[PDB]
Amino acid sequence: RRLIVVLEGASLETVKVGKTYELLNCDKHKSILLKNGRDPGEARPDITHQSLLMLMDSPLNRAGLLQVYIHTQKNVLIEVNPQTRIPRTFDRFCGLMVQLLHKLSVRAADGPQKLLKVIKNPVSDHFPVGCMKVGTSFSIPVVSDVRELVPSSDPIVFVVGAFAHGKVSVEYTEKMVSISNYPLSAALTCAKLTTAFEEVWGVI
Amino acid sequence: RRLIVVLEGASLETVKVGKTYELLNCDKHKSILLKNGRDPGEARPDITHQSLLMLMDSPLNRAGLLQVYIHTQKNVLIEVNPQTRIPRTFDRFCGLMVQLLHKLSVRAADGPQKLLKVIKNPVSDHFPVGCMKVGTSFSIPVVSDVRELVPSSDPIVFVVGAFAHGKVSVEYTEKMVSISNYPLSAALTCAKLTTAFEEVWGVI
Amino acid sequence: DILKLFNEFIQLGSDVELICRCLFFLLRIHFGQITSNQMLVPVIEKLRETTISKV
Amino acid sequence: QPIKLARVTKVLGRTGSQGQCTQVRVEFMDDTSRSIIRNVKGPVREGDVLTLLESEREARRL
Amino acid sequence: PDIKLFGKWSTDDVQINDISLQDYIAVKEKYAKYLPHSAGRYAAKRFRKAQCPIVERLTNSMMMHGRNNGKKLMTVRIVKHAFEIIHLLTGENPLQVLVNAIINSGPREDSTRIGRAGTVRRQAVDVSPLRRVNQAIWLLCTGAREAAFRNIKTIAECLADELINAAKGSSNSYAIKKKDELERVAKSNR
RNA sequence: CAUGAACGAGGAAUUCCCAGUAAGUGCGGGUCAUAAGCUUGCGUUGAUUAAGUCCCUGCCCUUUCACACCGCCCGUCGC
Ligand SMILES: Nc1ncnc2c1ncn2[C@@H]1O[C@H](CSCC[C@H](N)C(=O)O)[C@@H](O)[C@H]1O
Ligand SMILES: Nc1ncnc2c1ncn2[C@@H]1O[C@H](CSCC[C@H](N)C(=O)O)[C@@H](O)[C@H]1O
Ligand SMILES: [Mg+2]
Numbered sequence: 001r002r003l004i005v006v007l008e009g010a011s012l013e014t015v016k017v018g019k020t021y022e023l024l025n026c027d028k029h030k031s032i033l034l035k036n037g038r039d040p041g042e043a044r045p046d047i048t049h050q051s052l053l054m055l056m057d058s059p060l061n062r063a064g065l066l067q068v069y070i071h072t073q074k075n076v077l078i079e080v081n082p083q084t085r086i087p088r089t090f091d092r093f094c095g096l097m098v099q100l101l102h103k104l105s106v107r108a109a110d111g112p113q114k115l116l117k118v119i120k121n122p123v124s125d126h127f128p129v130g131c132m133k134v135g136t137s138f139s140i141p142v143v144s145d146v147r148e149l150v151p152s153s154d155p156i157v158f159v160v161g162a163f164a165h166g167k168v169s170v171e172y173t174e175k176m177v178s179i180s181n182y183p184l185s186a187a188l189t190c191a192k193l194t195t196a197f198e199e200v201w202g203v204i
Numbered sequence: 205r206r207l208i209v210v211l212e213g214a215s216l217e218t219v220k221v222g223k224t225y226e227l228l229n230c231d232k233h234k235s236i237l238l239k240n241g242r243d244p245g246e247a248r249p250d251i252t253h254q255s256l257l258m259l260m261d262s263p264l265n266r267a268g269l270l271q272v273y274i275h276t277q278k279n280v281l282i283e284v285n286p287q288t289r290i291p292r293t294f295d296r297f298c299g300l301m302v303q304l305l306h307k308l309s310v311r312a313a314d315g316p317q318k319l320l321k322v323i324k325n326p327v328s329d330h331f332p333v334g335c336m337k338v339g340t341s342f343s344i345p346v347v348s349d350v351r352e353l354v355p356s357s358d359p360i361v362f363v364v365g366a367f368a369h370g371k372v373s374v375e376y377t378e379k380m381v382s383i384s385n386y387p388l389s390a391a392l393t394c395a396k397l398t399t400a401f402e403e404v405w406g407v408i
Numbered sequence: 409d410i411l412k413l414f415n416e417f418i419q420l421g422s423d424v425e426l427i428c429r430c431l432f433f434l435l436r437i438h439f440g441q442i443t444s445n446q447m448l449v450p451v452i453e454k455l456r457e458t459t460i461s462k463v
Numbered sequence: 464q465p466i467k468l469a470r471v472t473k474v475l476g477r478t479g480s481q482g483q484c485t486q487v488r489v490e491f492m493d494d495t496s497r498s499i500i501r502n503v504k505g506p507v508r509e510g511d512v513l514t515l516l517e518s519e520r521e522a523r524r525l
Numbered sequence: 526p527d528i529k530l531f532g533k534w535s536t537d538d539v540q541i542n543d544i545s546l547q548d549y550i551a552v553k554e555k556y557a558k559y560l561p562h563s564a565g566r567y568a569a570k571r572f573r574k575a576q577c578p579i580v581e582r583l584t585n586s587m588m589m590h591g592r593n594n595g596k597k598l599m600t601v602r603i604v605k606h607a608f609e610i611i612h613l614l615t616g617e618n619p620l621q622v623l624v625n626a627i628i629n630s631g632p633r634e635d636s637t638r639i640g641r642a643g644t645v646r647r648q649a650v651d652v653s654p655l656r657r658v659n660q661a662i663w664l665l666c667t668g669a670r671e672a673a674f675r676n677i678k679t680i681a682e683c684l685a686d687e688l689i690n691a692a693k694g695s696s697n698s699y700a701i702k703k704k705d706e707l708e709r710v711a712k713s714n715r
Numbered sequence: 716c717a718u719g720a721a722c723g724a725g726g727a728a729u730u731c732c733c734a735g736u737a738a739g740u741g742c743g744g745g746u747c748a749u750a751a752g753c754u755u756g757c758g759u760u761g762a763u764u765a766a767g768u769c770c771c772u773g774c775c776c777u778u779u780c781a782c783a784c785c786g787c788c789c790g791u792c793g794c
Binding site for chain 5: 468479480481483484501502503504505506507508510511512513514515516517520
Binding site: 440443444 | 496
């Protein structure tokens with residue numbers, strides 16, 4: 001058994017200024033974003049950053065029952081190694097991601113094992129067989145107990161939007177659930193979803 | 205009944221470079237940190253920044269059952285209004301701390317209420333009298349589940365450190381707990397306390 | 409316990425003046441409490457013969 | 464344990480860490496002819512009456 | 526002749542139920558006065574303020590903070606109005622209520638302090654009757670002052686409710702809670 | 716006449732204070748120096764806490780014939 005969590009609407013891209021390559025941030029890049037009339041505040045690479053930190057540092061990941069996949073708005077799919085470590089600081093994390101989209105992969109600094117690498121569209125094909133897909137949004141009127149939905153020994157996919165505004169909608173999810181009646185961050189959503197699967201799989 | 209969270213040993217202090225005042229960051233201010241022989245890699249407001257987002261969006265804070273206290277390394281105490289909207293992105297968060305640490309208070313933009321304020325040490329004077337005070341460390345051999353420590357009708361104080369290395373050791377705590385067999389982050393720690401209190405106190 | 413030991417110090421005959429000074433001070437400050445306790449009856453009986461004969 | 468009342472017979476001196484406390488000798492109002500040594504906080508003089516919630520504790524004990 | 530406080534509150538029926546505090550509460554026939562304003566010198570010598578009538582002590586203790594310094598006639602009027610309110614609400618002698626409140630509000634054991642830079646360590650000790658009376662008066666006055674602040678309620682009314690609750694022994698009063706917490710801290714580290 | 720800003724008791728720390736004292740209030744003067752972008756008198760109202768130790772931070776000293784009490788501080792380097 002294994003938990004699968006998928007991140008969609010990730011705002012990850014690299015933009016050239018001067019001669020350099022930088023991760024696209026609303027903070028660092030007001031002026032260029034105001035150019036071309038593209039919407040300020042839509043670029044939220046930070047949301048992806050902290051959300052990883054809750055996911056990666058979770059004991060179940062250290063227990064090894066956790067895999068994370070990301071769908072960017074740019075329709076790019078990237079894998080993460082269980083032994084990958086995320087920079088705690090924002091810009092060091094941006095230090096990696098700029099190297100990602102160009103170099104397309106990240107070997108470990110202590111070995112040729114691949115920490116990061118872009119995988120092929122679609123990710124639906126990379127799913128293990130006999131795995132069921134659950135998408136999560138606040139807008140569902142009925143709240144589901146998370147501990148109820150767990151398969152005892154089966155993989156299960158959770159699809160969590162890394163976007164600022166909108167609603168999750170992708171084709172291959174079988175059902176929609178809500179886990180709270182409050183408008184929640186994806187950051188705690190990841191923390192909450194990891195939290196309930198701790199007990200049912202017996203990891204403490 | 206309320207949940208009181210104390211962030212102990214926060215690394216919140218301001219430095220001046222050029223003509224500008226800004227919060228002391230390890231990566232940004234690497235050069236000046238090596239000046240004066242100050243230990244590099246101790247300027248970590250992000251643990252403080254990351255924990256606040258975890259607490260302030262929590263459903264327990266949504267229902268109005270949370271109050272958060274910050275005690276920085278330079279012996280400055282900050283009270284957090286539950287109505288406050290924390291700056292999600294790091295740089296505007298840094299500007300907020302500089303403004304608060306200089307002007308000693310922060311007024312709401314659209315409301316007359318003060319949101320942030322520096323108050324009188326020690327923090328133990330501001331607790332409700334007779335309340336339970338608990339500290340959290342991975343160093344305790346016995347792992348305790350959060351839910352049975354939750355009081356039915358009384359306020360309680362939980363103390364979490366805002367540092368990467370060291371042990372929480374402050375005077376007013378009377379029993380010291382471990383709640384996982386793994387080293388976790390503060391942001392996860394602030395996450396996994398607040399959700400367990402929510403299910404005990406009927407916050408869903 | 410001290411009263412039993414003070415009986416020993418007198419009967420051996422050493423340092424009588426200081427012990428008697430110590431002995432008489434304790435008896436006055438604890439006069440009432442000593443009188444109530446019947447366990448102390450044998451103790452003072454040996455003190456009574458020992459002290460006056462030695463002095 | 465019943466509450467006890469004591470009368471101050473001798474004021475011995477100023478003790479404590481900072482000299483704030485006062486060592487005194489007290490005797491119980493009961494006809495038990497007992498007397499102990501107690502620590503008092505605040506101005507205390509001869510003839511005062513003290514309320515002891517627990518009368519078994521001794522101020523100078525190993 | 527008979528001396529009654531404010532011309533209407535008798536002192537003969539007032540009685541003290543605590544043996545320890547009988548010598549430190551001055552309300553009886555020799556200390557019976559018409560007004561709590563005597564222009565005496567009770568702070569000149571140690572232990573002399575035990576001879577000051579307790580109503581005058583309360584009046585002196587209500588001249589705070591700062592904005593009330595030196596205004597004793599106003600405090601006398603406040604005390605008179607509070608006594609009238611107490612009599613209207615309960616129907617008993619307000620002097621007896623004040624005596625009972627002072628008896629109940631006085632802590633019996635406190636804690637002495639041995640403190641260094643790192644931590645402070647703690648020990649239980651006893652309290653003299655004079656400090657008991659002083660601390661009871663201080664706690665009652667502080668409770669009334671904090672209750673009246675930034676609230677639509679006269680200071681005399683808040684003082685009346687504080688005395689009523691303290692004489693009742695209820696936990697709704699500031700002084701009772703403070704005394705209970707101090708006694709609990711003293712008890713816990715015996 | 717009109718308008719109605721911050722300010723809801725003021726952090727890290729720091730200074731001062733034991734009786735007609737702390738604090739509030741008024742009324743005078745300008746005296747061969749100072750003072751009026753202020754100083755200095757005089758009256759009026761008038762408290763809480765404390766009256767004792769060397770624990771911290773320091774200071775000043777000492778350790779050569781009534782009755783009664785008491786019964787010699789230690790070390791180093793020189794000459
Ligand atoms: N109450 C709730 N229950 C389940 N998921 C929630 C939730 N509140 C927010 N989320 C999730 O948190 C992520 C960021 S919130 C972003 C907006 C999102 N469409 C929404 O419904 O609020 C989204 O992917 C959403 O699925
Ligand atoms: N497994 C765990 N159980 C309870 N508290 C934990 C924990 N892991 C980390 N913490 C708390 O989270 C804070 C930051 S984690 C920093 C490391 C910390 N010195 C440690 O003992 O692991 C620390 O103050 C620590 O008390
Ligand atoms: Mg000294």
